[PDB]
Ligand SMILES: *[C@@H]1O[C@H](CO)[C@@H](O[C@@H]2O[C@H](CO)[C@@H](O)[C@H](O)[C@H]2NC(C)=O)[C@H](O)[C@H]1NC(C)=O
Ligand SMILES: [O-][O-]
């Protein structure tokens with residue numbers, strides 16, 4: 642239970658729900674076939690925001706994860722419960738109007754992931770124990786203009802069967818400046834990119850303990 646409730650750009654937090662479409666409640670999506678898997682949604686409610694955040698291509702933005710919208714600290718419990726082990730992931734989608742585009746459908750490409758490292762530590766544990774900071778590089782080589790940024794944490798502690806995996810995601814609204822357009826990503830759809838049968842979705846993280854993890858979705862796009 643967690644929310645990507647603000648984005649840091651150029652080292653400055655852009656504000657709570659400012660340029661990030663935040664849900665009222667911190668619960669997960671569990672149905673990977675739902676329209677809500679793209680940018681969150683029903684049975685939650687997600688707020689619209691008029692802010693589109695300018696970001697220089699090639700630089701990092703940092704999603705700031707918090708337990709609830711009103712949370713005021715950054716200790717582990719202020720981010721997400723330590724039972725919630727799994728990957729962190731981020732995607733972009735080119736859109737016409739980042740303040741209104743829904744994010745459902747084709748156009749997503751993966752730009753970051755952190756599953757399980759060679760020491761058995763999960764991406765979510767780096768966020769939980771890193772003050773909620775989920776750093777994401779905006780590629781330098783993509784086309785400039787308006788995008789959605791979907792940042793996600795998947796908790797797998799209850800994922801031995803499907804449904805069970807818990808998907809926490811929010812979409813931020815970006816204007817990417819300086820992108821060279823030198824490379825056009827291949828894209829996937831949300832819903833569509835994840836299946837309840839995926840090895841990273843239906844998984845028993847303790848039975849036996851896993852030492853390798855396959856993050857769901859496509860490969861990370863690189864310039
Ligand atoms: C910018 O974001 C990228 C991820 O998109 C970060 O790159 C990862 O950094 C970790 C921590 O050093 C490494 O273990 C990974 O190997 C890196 N991944 C890649 C693909 O390079 C990068 O550290 C971020 N920069 C900042 C300032 O947070
Ligand atoms: O969230 O369990």
Ligand SMILES: [Cu+2]
Nearest residue numbers: 642643722725
């Ligand atoms: Cu939870």
